[PDB]
């Protein structure tokens, strides 16, 4: 059950960010993965996302929910390094919370604290 960091080496990830930032300078590179213990949400179709740098976290969350085709009654949370602010621009989350490899990592679940 290998996560993205386990499938690609640290060097491969650093190199991937460098090139994708050079080719897509208006986009934030984001890794979005499902919580390993998740039991009721579907898995996403892909792992690596490019998010425009005028978008905020509230907007991203609604977009991902829609990708998963969730019913209104279904809980969804998006965690950036374990913390569950919706208004923050994804550029600012990136500057603050990006990994040493340069990706911004997120995990989604139907629980908010996990776990």
């Amino acid at each position: 059950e290998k996560t993205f960091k386990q499938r690609r080496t640290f060097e491969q990830r650093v190199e991937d960010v460098r090139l994708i930032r050079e080719q897509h300078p208006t986009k934030i590179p984001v890794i979005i993965e499902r919580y390993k213990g998740e039991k009721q949400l579907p898995v996403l179709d892909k792992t690596k996302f490019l998010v425009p740098d005028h978008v905020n976290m509230s907007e991203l969350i609604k977009i991902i929910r829609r990708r998963l085709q969730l019913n209104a009654n279904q809980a969804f949370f998006l965690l950036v390094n374990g913390h569950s602010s919706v208004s923050t621009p994804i550029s600012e989350v990136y500057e603050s919370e990006k990994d040493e490899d340069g990706f911004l990592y997120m995990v989604y679940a139907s629980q908010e604290t996990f776990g």
Partner: peptide
């Protein structure tokens, strides 16, 4: 997994 492609997210 398709680690070789990025989804390009845009506002609707």
């Amino acid at each position: 997994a398709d680690d070789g492609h990025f989804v390009s997210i845009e506002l609707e």
